[PDB]
Amino acid sequence: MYLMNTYSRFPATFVYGKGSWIYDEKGNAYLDFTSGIAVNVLGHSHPRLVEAIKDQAEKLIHCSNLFWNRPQMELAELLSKNTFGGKVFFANTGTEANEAAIKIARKYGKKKSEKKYRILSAHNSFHGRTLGSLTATGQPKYQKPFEPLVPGFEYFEFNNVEDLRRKMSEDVCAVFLEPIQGESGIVPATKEFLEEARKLCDEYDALLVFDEVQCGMGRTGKLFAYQKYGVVPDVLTTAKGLGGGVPIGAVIVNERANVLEPGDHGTTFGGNPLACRAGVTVIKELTKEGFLEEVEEKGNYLMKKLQEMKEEYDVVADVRGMGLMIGIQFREEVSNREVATKCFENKLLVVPAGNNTIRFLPPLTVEYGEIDLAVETLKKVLQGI
Amino acid sequence: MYLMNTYSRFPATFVYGKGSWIYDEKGNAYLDFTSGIAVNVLGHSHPRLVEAIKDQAEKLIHCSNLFWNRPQMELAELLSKNTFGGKVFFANTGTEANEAAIKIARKYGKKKSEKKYRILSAHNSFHGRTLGSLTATGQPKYQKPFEPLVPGFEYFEFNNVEDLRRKMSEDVCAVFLEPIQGESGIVPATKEFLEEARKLCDEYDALLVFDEVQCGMGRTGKLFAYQKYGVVPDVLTTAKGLGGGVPIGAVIVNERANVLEPGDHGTTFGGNPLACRAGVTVIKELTKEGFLEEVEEKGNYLMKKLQEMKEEYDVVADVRGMGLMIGIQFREEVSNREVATKCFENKLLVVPAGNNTIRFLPPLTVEYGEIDLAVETLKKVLQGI
Numbered sequence: 070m071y072l073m074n075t076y077s078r079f080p081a082t083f084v085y086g087k088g089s090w091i092y093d094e095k096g097n098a099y100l101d102f103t104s105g106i107a108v109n110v111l112g113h114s115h116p117r118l119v120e121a122i123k124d125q126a127e128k129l130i131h132c133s134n135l136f137w138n139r140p141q142m143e144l145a146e147l148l149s150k151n152t153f154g155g156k157v158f159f160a161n162t163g164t165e166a167n168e169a170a171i172k173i174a175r176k177y178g179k180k181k182s183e184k185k186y187r188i189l190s191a192h193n194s195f196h197g198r199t200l201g202s203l204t205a206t207g208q209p210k211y212q213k214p215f216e217p218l219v220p221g222f223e224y225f226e227f228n229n230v231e232d233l234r235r236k237m238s239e240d241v242c243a244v245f246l247e248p249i250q251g252e253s254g255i256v257p258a259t260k261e262f263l264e265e266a267r268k269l270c271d272e273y274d275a276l277l278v279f280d281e282v283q284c285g286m287g288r289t290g291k292l293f294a295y296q297k298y299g300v301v302p303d304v305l306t307t308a309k310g311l312g313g314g315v316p317i318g319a320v321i322v323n324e325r326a327n328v329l330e331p332g333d334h335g336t337t338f339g340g341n342p343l344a345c346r347a348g349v350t351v352i353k354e355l356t357k358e359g360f361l362e363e364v365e366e367k368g369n370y371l372m373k374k375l376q377e378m379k380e381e382y383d384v385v386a387d388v389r390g391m392g393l394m395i396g397i398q399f400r401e402e403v404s405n406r407e408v409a410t411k412c413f414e415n416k417l418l419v420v421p422a423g424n425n426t427i428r429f430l431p432p433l434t435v436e437y438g439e440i441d442l443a444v445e446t447l448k449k450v451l452q453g454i
Numbered sequence: 455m456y457l458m459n460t461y462s463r464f465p466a467t468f469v470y471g472k473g474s475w476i477y478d479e480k481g482n483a484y485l486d487f488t489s490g491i492a493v494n495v496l497g498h499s500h501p502r503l504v505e506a507i508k509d510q511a512e513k514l515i516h517c518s519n520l521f522w523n524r525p526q527m528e529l530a531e532l533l534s535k536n537t538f539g540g541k542v543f544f545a546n547t548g549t550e551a552n553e554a555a556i557k558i559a560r561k562y563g564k565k566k567s568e569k570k571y572r573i574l575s576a577h578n579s580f581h582g583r584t585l586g587s588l589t590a591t592g593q594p595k596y597q598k599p600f601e602p603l604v605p606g607f608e609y610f611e612f613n614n615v616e617d618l619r620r621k622m623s624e625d626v627c628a629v630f631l632e633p634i635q636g637e638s639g640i641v642p643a644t645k646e647f648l649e650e651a652r653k654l655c656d657e658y659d660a661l662l663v664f665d666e667v668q669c670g671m672g673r674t675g676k677l678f679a680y681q682k683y684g685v686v687p688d689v690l691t692t693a694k695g696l697g698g699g700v701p702i703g704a705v706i707v708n709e710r711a712n713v714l715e716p717g718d719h720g721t722t723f724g725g726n727p728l729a730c731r732a733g734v735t736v737i738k739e740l741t742k743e744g745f746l747e748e749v750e751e752k753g754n755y756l757m758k759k760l761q762e763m764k765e766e767y768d769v770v771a772d773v774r775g776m777g778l779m780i781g782i783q784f785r786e787e788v789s790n791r792e793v794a795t796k797c798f799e800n801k802l803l804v805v806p807a808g809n810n811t812i813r814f815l816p817p818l819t820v821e822y823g824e825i826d827l828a829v830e831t832l833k834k835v836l837q838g839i
């Protein structure tokens with residue numbers, strides 16, 4: 070009774086988790102296909118992550134950015150080496166990472182002109198709730214009560230090359246894009262659209278920023294979605310799965326975008342040894358030989374079953390996604406919220422999203438048998454919906 | 455070589471900490487009077503905090519705000535009961551907590567008028583680096599490269615009743631104040647100024663927001679500084695020490711300010727069981743019988759010694775503070791940065807701040823003998839500065 074009423078929740082209190090399962094106070098087991106909203110990349114209570122956390126906790130958890138710490142240095146090196154090789158800034162959340170990206174873009178633009186501060190983002194995009202990220206978020210409903218927001222932002226239709234082109238100008242300092250939109254209902258960008266974004270940013274001297282907070286850290290079958298697409302951004306933001314459950318966020322920039330100087334930006338908790346230790350553990354597991362290959366295989370298996378379901382069930386209008394980031398859209402007469410609720414009642418946890426969809430976001434360590442259970446449960450719900 | 459160059463650091467890599475001491479890779483011991491910048495309230499590797507973290511890590515660290523979790527519920531109850539009894543929203547950092555406060559203020563204002571969106575904050579205040587909090591931050595140097603920022607903010611001089619009065623209007627939805635400014639060099643508000651702020655907010659129907667991210671969680675000798683002053687805000691933000699090192703932030707509102715509704719605001723990591731477990735541990739330790747009384751006694755002891763130093767050393771221009779949040783200002787010909795560096799070379803860690811000051815921010819568990827060592831080290835540095 071002491072929490073603000075800001076969330077729409079499923080009626081369950083969870084106290085323990087192991088792998089793909091989470092349990093309530095009475096021991097009832099739920100198959101967790103939410104991953105805490107694409108966060109628990111290694112599932113719950115993964116032995117290596119738990120051990121790393123316990124080990125670091127008895128050593129040092131926070132020293133501040135007045136000094137250096139080893140986990141922070143190691144994670145920065147791993148992120149640079151496993152991406153397009155740039156510099157790293159550690160934040161604590163997805164919205165903070167995007168705020169850093171916005172600031173990097175703004176300073177970059179002012180290197181050329183005081184008028185070069187415009188930022189373009191997509192309609193229905195989601196980049197965060199803090200005011201900078203909220204302005205980038207192309208969704209009026211989430212902005213209205215809090216206006217006026219940050220000036221200089223304009224929106225274009227996702228995957229619409231023509232619309233993005235018409236809104237470009239020399240005064241644009243950055244273009245923000247989620248390689249695969251998440252909150253809007255899992256909408257993959259087309260390779261062509263991303264390629265055009267890359268070309269337009271080069272033409273107008275703007276920074277291409279990829280927000281991989283939800284689609285990053287192995288969920289697509291590669292470490293980052295941009296690697297699947299073959300389009301390299303100037304700036305890349307990551308969070309959620311980066312820490313496998315421990316709050317952490319990061320921004321990676323190439324040399325062109327490496328414009329921040331001492332005092333330009335900072336954070337008290339960002340880069341602390343406990344969170345970075347978690348990140349190092351996660352990256353080492355994700356990059357382990359054969360791991361991402363298994364993710365791709367499991368993703369193909371799950372997608373195959375859901376696509377069959379799309380043809381077989383008239384209430385299922387569409388299935389979209391990549392790797393283990395999949396969205397299922399229902400016909401308008403069927404409520405995605407009702408479907409999610411019925412799934413919950415049958416011990417399957419899914420995440421509602423826009424466009425009347427539910428998201429299947431299982432941990433990357435999910436078992437084939439668990440994929441079978443989830444699909445079976447959804448089918449039974451739909452057979453009575 | 456992989457981290458962005460955003461910080462001015464002391465040349466040391468720390469890997470272990472215990473109590474008021476932190477150690478480098480070779481085992482050299484440093485007396486940590488930074489508390490990781492007012493974060494490590496219980497010192498490093500406190501047995502109870504370490505045990506709580508290890509215990510929770512093997513159970514559940516993140517489930518998302520789609521569900522309820524026990525540590526989150528327990529911490530919300532403790533924060534409400536130990537303050538002015540309101541509702542709680544969990545963020546992950548100080549800047550995120552203030553962003554939530556800004557959003558709460560904005561929605562409150564629109565309940566009365568679409569023009570009621572102005573927010574007042576103090577010159578030299580510091581509320582965070584994300585764009586909303588950065589606009590609240592009354593420091594142009596930190597804003598310039600990133601403009602335009604959020605519209606509707608205006609600044610007044612801290613502790614200047616007349617200036618605050620002249621900037622008030624019916625279009626103001628909130629007044630932001632740090633009961634004791636930190637980054638600017640530890641500047642306590644006068645009780646009279648805070649009382650006038652409270653009256654002006656009631657007169658113009660605005661929310662009084664106290665940012666206790668740095669002065670909160672026991673550092674002043676009471677749980678929160680507002681309790682020392684006897685002036686109650688509508689909204690209170692907290693972070694840093696709340697988690698004793700684990701990233702966490704919170705916003706507490708009374709009924710008047712409880713205006714957020716489902717979907718208005720949220721966060722992926724906010725309120726996770728691991729961070730809230732840490733917060734519960736911290737609050738239980740801080741509220742333990744006699745704990746805060748000891749903090750007040752140690753604060754009085756340290757302040758006494760530093761005030762004597764002010765009279766004795768001509769290079770020391772002023773000493774300000776409350777509890778264990780103390781700032782030492784040097785004459786202009788003496789560099790606060792040089793003093794901090796020399797302290798570091800002599801194994802004492804302090805935090806530089808504005809107004810040519812250094813901050814003494816020892817853990818609340820600091821020993822009297824450690825206070826003696828710190829003062830002795832500073833005196834020796836000044837005897838040769």
Ligand SMILES: Cc1ncc(COP(=O)(O)O)c(C=O)c1O
Pocket residue numbers: 162163164165167195196197198247251252280281282283284308309720721722723
């Ligand atoms: C693409 C994207 N960016 C940013 C965010 C916000 O991340 P956070 O909640 O940690 O601030 C989300 C959350 O869903 C997201 O999907």
Ligand SMILES: Cc1ncc(COP(=O)(O)O)c(C=O)c1O
Pocket residue numbers: 335336337338547548549550552580581582583632636637665666667668669693694
């Ligand atoms: C009063 C105050 N508010 C907010 C902040 C920022 O907190 P964070 O770095 O966790 O975003 C600080 C940091 O020094 C602060 O002193």
Ligand code: NA
Pocket residue numbers: 378379380381382383384385386387
């Ligand atoms: Na169908």
Ligand code: NA
Pocket residue numbers: 379380382383
């Ligand atoms: Na059909």
Ligand code: NA
Pocket residue numbers: 763764765766767768769770771772
């Ligand atoms: Na003096």
Ligand code: NA
Pocket residue numbers: 764765767768
């Ligand atoms: Na003097």
